[PDB]
Amino acid sequence: GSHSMRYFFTSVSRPGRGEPRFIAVGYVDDTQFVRFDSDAASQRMEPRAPWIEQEGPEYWDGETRKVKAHSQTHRVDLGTLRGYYNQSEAGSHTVQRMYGCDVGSDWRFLRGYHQYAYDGKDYIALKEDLRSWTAADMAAQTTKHKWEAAHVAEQLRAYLEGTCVEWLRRYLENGKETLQRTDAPKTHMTHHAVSDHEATLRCWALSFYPAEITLTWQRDGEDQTQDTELVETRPAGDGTFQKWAAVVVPSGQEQRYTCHVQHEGLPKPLTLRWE
């Protein structure tokens, strides 16, 4: 299938005392593989997947140097943004940054992204051309002109189409036993009577990877959305994901209802009926 590498950075200012909390995480697809937390003891980029542990001291030194530098850039940015928005020094504010690259089934570059937010709202983002900028407001427009003058997009484009994809491919090979393995959802249906007259059927998908999945209900072969509930896909905690969809039905009429499960790990979609 297709693959991605993404890095996520969060900095939160601490007006009362000290410097911002800074947390960075890296993912390949839906697998976290590195982290940095300013509150942690190591003050280093740390491994979070077995397949990255083999990287040598040069790797860990460089990653640490770069991520610590990111944290300082965000610290300064928090100050700059406070000024741009004429805000008090008294409140906590947040900067977030996310970037990454997608490759296709042939592992060739598909798309790149790099976006930045202040207090949870879009601030500035690299457009899909990897040349242009979307600035959400006039502060961001100031930043955009600064970033033009500093050749920021050129550097990001080079990283996104080069280093990003090259190292993604490296990771995919080194962690192939898990990263290139799909875990099909284990599926079953439960039944929960609400009265003599009706019952909830709940269609479960468990222990699947990657997280992308579609669960749908049909009645007599046509999509049903009335009287249904679909929960957000959630992490099991062991690297896999879970989801369920439920429908309320007249008791005795269960066989009219089918749950349909689509997932990359399934050659053909599954159909479940109450047994």
Binding site: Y7, K66, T73, V76, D77, Y116, K146, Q155, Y159, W167
Partner: peptide, 9 residues
């Protein structure tokens, strides 16, 4: 591999 930090905002 992480990118080098960008210019400040």
């Amino acid at each position: 591999r992480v990118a080098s930090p960008t210019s400040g905002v």
